[PDB]
Design a binder for this molecule. Sequence first.
Ligand SMILES: [Mn+2]
Ligand SMILES: [Mn+2]
Ligand SMILES: [Mn+2]
Ligand SMILES: [Mn+2]
Ligand SMILES: [Mn+2]
Ligand SMILES: [Mn+2]
Ligand SMILES: [Mn+2]
Ligand SMILES: [Mn+2]
Ligand SMILES: [Mn+2]
Ligand SMILES: [Mn+2]
Ligand SMILES: [Mn+2]
Ligand SMILES: [Mn+2]
Lengths: 301, 301, 301, 301, 301, 301
Amino acid sequence: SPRYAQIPTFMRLPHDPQPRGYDVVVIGAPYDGGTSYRPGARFGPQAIRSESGLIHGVGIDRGPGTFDLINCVDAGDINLTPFDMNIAIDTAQSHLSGLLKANAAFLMIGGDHSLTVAALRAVAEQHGPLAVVHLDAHSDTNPAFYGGRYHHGTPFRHGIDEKLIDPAAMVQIGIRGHNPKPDSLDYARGHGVRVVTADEFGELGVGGTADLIREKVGQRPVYVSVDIDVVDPAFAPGTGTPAPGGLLSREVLALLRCVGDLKPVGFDVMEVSPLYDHGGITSILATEIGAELLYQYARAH
Amino acid sequence: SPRYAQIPTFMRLPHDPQPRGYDVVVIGAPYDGGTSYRPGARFGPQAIRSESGLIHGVGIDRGPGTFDLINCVDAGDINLTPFDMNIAIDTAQSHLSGLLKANAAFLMIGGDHSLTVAALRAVAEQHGPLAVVHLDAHSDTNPAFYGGRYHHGTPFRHGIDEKLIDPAAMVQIGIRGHNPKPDSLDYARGHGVRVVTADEFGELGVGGTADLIREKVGQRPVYVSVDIDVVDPAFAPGTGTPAPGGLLSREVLALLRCVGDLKPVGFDVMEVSPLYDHGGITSILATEIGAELLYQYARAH
Amino acid sequence: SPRYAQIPTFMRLPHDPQPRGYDVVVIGAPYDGGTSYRPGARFGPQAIRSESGLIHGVGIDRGPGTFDLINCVDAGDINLTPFDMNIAIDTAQSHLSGLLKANAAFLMIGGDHSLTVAALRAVAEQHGPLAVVHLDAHSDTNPAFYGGRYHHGTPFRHGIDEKLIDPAAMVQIGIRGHNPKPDSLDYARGHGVRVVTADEFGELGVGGTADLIREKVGQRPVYVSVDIDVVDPAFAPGTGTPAPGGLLSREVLALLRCVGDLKPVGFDVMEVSPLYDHGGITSILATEIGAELLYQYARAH
Amino acid sequence: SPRYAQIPTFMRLPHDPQPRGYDVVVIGAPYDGGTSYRPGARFGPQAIRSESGLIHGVGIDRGPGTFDLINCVDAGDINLTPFDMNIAIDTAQSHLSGLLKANAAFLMIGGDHSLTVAALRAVAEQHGPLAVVHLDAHSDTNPAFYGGRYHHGTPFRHGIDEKLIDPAAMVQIGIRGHNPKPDSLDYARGHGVRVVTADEFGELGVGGTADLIREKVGQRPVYVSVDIDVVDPAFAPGTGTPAPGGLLSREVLALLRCVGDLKPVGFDVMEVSPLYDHGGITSILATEIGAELLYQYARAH
Amino acid sequence: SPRYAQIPTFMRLPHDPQPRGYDVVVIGAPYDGGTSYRPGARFGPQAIRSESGLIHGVGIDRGPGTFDLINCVDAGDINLTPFDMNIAIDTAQSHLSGLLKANAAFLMIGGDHSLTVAALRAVAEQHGPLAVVHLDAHSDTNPAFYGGRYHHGTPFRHGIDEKLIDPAAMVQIGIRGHNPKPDSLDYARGHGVRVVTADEFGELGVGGTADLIREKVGQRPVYVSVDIDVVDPAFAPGTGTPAPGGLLSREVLALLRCVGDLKPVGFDVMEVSPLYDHGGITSILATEIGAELLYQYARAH
Amino acid sequence: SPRYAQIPTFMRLPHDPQPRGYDVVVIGAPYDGGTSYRPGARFGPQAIRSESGLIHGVGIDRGPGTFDLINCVDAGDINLTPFDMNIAIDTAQSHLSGLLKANAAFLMIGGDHSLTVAALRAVAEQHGPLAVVHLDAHSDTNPAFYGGRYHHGTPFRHGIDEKLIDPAAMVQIGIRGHNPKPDSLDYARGHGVRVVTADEFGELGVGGTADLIREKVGQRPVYVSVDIDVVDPAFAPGTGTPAPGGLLSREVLALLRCVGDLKPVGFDVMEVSPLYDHGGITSILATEIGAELLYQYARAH
Ligand SMILES: [Mn+2]
Ligand SMILES: [Mn+2]
Ligand SMILES: [Mn+2]
Ligand SMILES: [Mn+2]
Ligand SMILES: [Mn+2]
Ligand SMILES: [Mn+2]
Ligand SMILES: [Mn+2]
Ligand SMILES: [Mn+2]
Ligand SMILES: [Mn+2]
Ligand SMILES: [Mn+2]
Ligand SMILES: [Mn+2]
Ligand SMILES: [Mn+2]
């Protein structure tokens, strides 16, 4: 049976709009109301599902395969309105919380990074202050404002302010490019957030960074949020705010292997904007990233 | 609830892999093993479903809307192998026949036009020799050959040879471009098939051609097969064998309105090849064509 | 001096962010917060300006050329936020009103059609109830709702409700496809709006429709709003909600010639979404449409 | 044998870099040194050859097929430098003249329209003042200037000035858009050139225009020059200077049928710029146009 | 003479459909009947030839240039049917064997990787059991099946089973992603095939892997088969089954330098699918890879 | 205020066609008359400006931000004719010299690399023989010829011949691929130019190469010329002559940091050809490169 046949689900997992009893639920968040530049992330879930036919759960020289170790399912998407930022975030929180009431954790395949604040609220409600591993070209700890409380640059600002995240246990890797202001990282650092710029990542290497993550996160429940623009635009051209000089696909995938040494309670892959993608390579990468996280979840439990 | 949200089905119809009791079942045939030039029609069903979110059943100044008049469903796709032409055609016939055992008719959204021979066999088995309305830039009545019994240029040749079609009640509109040989249409015409070239269509007009169809088809059970390349490449660039100087989108959609004055027992929309499409306009058109046929089915019954 | 050289302005007109004393000001509205399906119209103004280098004011066998008859300028764009629908509409109204305080009229090159409610408010404030010529594939007279008061399907609903438009003097041409509900046009018609579907347009022809417009509009001050999706997706693939079976580019351009026989007090060209465009043909067409309106403005005065 | 197999030649004709004894030689002119806006026409010959696999010489209900009536061949390309306008034009003239020394006529598949002056010089040298049928969205009778003697807007200006063309026997169809100056057509008309704008073409129709051509050309040796941008950008997006509101593909192809009633001594299809093409539909159309001209040549002799 | 001028051949080499006496013949295999996901590799030969204009034989600081050291030619393509897998493979074998009867070796630029079994049969027939250097993201040693004996995942399975390859002298580099089953590599390894995953390649480095190849291949006649998907999708997006986290272009090109220390008797570059390519960079890379192999052939002899 | 709003200028800097008193003026050179293969670089300035909205002057953990340290402005473009190579180069020289008469230095965002000879003449006229840091995949020190005195392969040949450059103080990094002749680098090396091939760059590393630059350039006034094709086609597909196996985006950006330790008197970023770009990633990279140079200029002064 061809992998491009049949209605597309993430990695061809079974479909269940009202999942109950699974370890990890894959949930789509087709929304880009938080994008400040290029929109289009609302089609991310659809594109990612479409290309995921090429990725299975069986790695290489790994065990029996992710899906034989844990029970996963594709719960469809959250009905997020494209007309009201505040309403969409609340709907997201509500939906994500609902999932956690009957399932261990979820993997959000979405639109812009702003939606992560909803995930953090839902996950923190069930585990308490969370440790965070954030892969992004941008810090996403910028101030909100009137008529723009949830732009995709505020997710982790809210997380820290709302005590959803324990800054002393948060590490963001890949920061590069330009800050909106010269003292934009003072906030995150002042709160104890460990910032690893793309430059330092190059000095530390994958192993070095992996050790740093393990040391800063420990065994606290951790949320892994991945902004697709963390990798260089060459590997992920389909995104809203590309930033030249990013990580290689293999570097990111290799790094994520350390997640298996932690206690992940949730993750997401955001900012995929299909329209700007070339040959669907961004969606395919996004899929591979999701697959690696799902497998690491299994290894960790 | 946004139309781009949730797993995509044709026109967002309910999904049921084993449909029973419906008037018309939408079935995908993701296969391009019959394409002689550009492949890719295997992704047609997926692309068409994806863009169909923009098309509803409620026309304009029409009745209550197609889906309140008849019961339709998206039965997913036929598992067609991309490795063996003969096996795929048989699988298609078997699957399509299965659908007719518990449902009135089907609408095949597929890959290349070769698959239509399987539909004709399935439909003819339940209604006897069929009347045919074929929209295509090519006659598709060419000879088969060893190692290529079912290339997309043979569907209606088999239909006539196998007595699945009553040539005296077959009309193909839109023929233009180039025949493989100077006497290529002698076969169809010798059998009594009415050929209306794109040129003559221009002289007859939509109404004139509609009258011709009604007169040649009468009230016999009719199968309506539409090759997307019937319209000019400008309106449908996403197809395997484009042919300049074709019909306008509106001309084809207007023409299909006459189907409501007949007794349709099945139809298909083939040759959509997404990779060559621009802005998804081909898939969107293909969707609109399917919607018009579904509505005409309702009007006819 | 090459037309692709120098910072791009609409039709290479002079730039003046705070214009005063001109006949017609070209103003960009880079916003798509009202789009219900495909976003991207926020880049419309930029793309349209970019490709406008190919279009001059000198027609063919026309007079001395549009720009020697009237004084026009490119006023840049309105700073429209992508984070709040209500705030963007108010900012648009305010900015457009500002322009009318020192200039005769404006030509809004924008994002989604929802922004037209802001233009109608600004224009109506200076001329009173307006006559309207609306070219669109959709009526855009649908009900608003909580958390979505200004989706691009509500502009003319608000116009009528707010008494900004005199329905008895409004004509919309090109309607086709699907209404959200079977009784969706009852509203517009009940108010006396003349609806000319793409089908009727075909029967009436350009001349017939032009006479109808002149008769229904008279000499009342008229606002001409053009949704790029009025033309078939083949001619304008770069738009948010394509609708197959639309008008030909030449048909729309020819029709707009009748504007010179009226008293235009404003116009706009909306819904151009560059990302879905092919070869920039949509932006080029949008430019030509704007040029024709500017010229007709001159002819009318 | 698949049509996409083997090194590509125009319509899969035999290849012969030094042809002798043929009726019509297909020659490529990969050059865009004359383009004033979008470059890229230098790849036109290559793209056109590539897609020509879909077009044969056997029409529909026509005779035995073009290639059984006349002997044609693909002579490869003229080595045209992209660094010097004047040198390229001379090289073109020299090469084209060489072809005519041993073959009846040629079909130039090229780059920008400026190259036609070289063809006119070569053909006029063997037949004397020529009658001309020019299909273009622009008159191409603009003044040359220092450092730009051969921009693609000067071909027919030179033709008339150099007495290569008999203006009283020249007809250009499709003119639309914008003239560089309000009295830009005075030159052509003053010389007796019959200008049929896209607008008038609509009034005259294909038949009416065909009669006009026959009447104005008579039996004088005629050169048929076709600028691909004569058709609307929707049908030919792959060109340097698109002009909205153009002819339909079928209109142009139908019109060219009248060439068979004349005495054609040469023709060309110019301005195809592949990079801006969508789905290769422009190259495919260009191919079909060349095929129709080749067939009409045969019919005329 | 511009490199984009004249009918395109691989690296602008002379053309000869029936070559005799050359060292290396470049032969195209326009076929994708073995692709299991995205088709399109049938256009690989054409696209690769088209872009090869940018690559010459003269390296940098290398000797006199590849083409002055050995005699190469472009033999056109093998007429491979797109309708029957088994017939195409036999035709390929027959054609490739024919070439070896009068020429030293060949470089197959093709479609999907399944075609390599035909090359292995032809080469093994003249040299006996072969040593193999296989660059691919997938092992291609999967089981065949009824109605799919030659899908692109079976080439090296057949090679070993048919004794065309000496597994103890086979090395495949770049394996990554997902195996169809958790014990999928047991077969290759059980036969003594050295598998170097993309991960291990990173540890070994180019030099380390080069030493490993030299040691495992020795001086036995070796066939070098390169699947374009061995490099990360960012460098080669135009392929049927992309696999994130692949090698860098420079890594692969640098690695291939070790071929000059072996005794190459044949090579191929497969899976290039132009439709999914961006800016032709995949075809350009494929060309550069072919050039490096040709040069290494010369160095080795 | 959205960054995609308002007429686009490089990095949203103020616009001033006749700048006076600034430290660095950003000037566009929309010209590709020197391209030998793919044209299109004439749209480079426009595309780069368009995407530059994403890049600010405020780096990360850097000082107050580039634009608070120095005064920069976007001077628009040089009116370069696309019809005459020699005239365009002279116009460029004249315009660039004019800028230097009232501003410290300029950053040329242009078309093909041939234009750099004009910049070198203008800069050398005010500083004397210049030291040069050239990043390119090609040496660009090839011989000129009649009818092609300024093809993009001659810039640095002229620079040395005309004594505008002090070869003993010139370093070009990234050379790879193919030389037109086996002894093509003898010229540059014979003059004392330090050539660092992409291969050697890999051995030296960023730091090693940075030291080499500092040592070979010293404190002499230096011109930094960057050909976008220096990075692998994966990172910069939008260019005229791609060369596989190039540098990573981060490698080039990191390397340019050493410019701050020198005395830069001018720089340029050339060969960006938008049409071949994917997701605008080439233009975005080009922007980032320009930003880094501007910042390093500030650091150096
Ligand atoms: Mn983010
Ligand atoms: Mn980010
Ligand atoms: Mn067909
Ligand atoms: Mn067809
Ligand atoms: Mn609208
Ligand atoms: Mn609309
Ligand atoms: Mn022309
Ligand atoms: Mn023209
Ligand atoms: Mn393979
Ligand atoms: Mn592979
Ligand atoms: Mn260069
Ligand atoms: Mn270069």
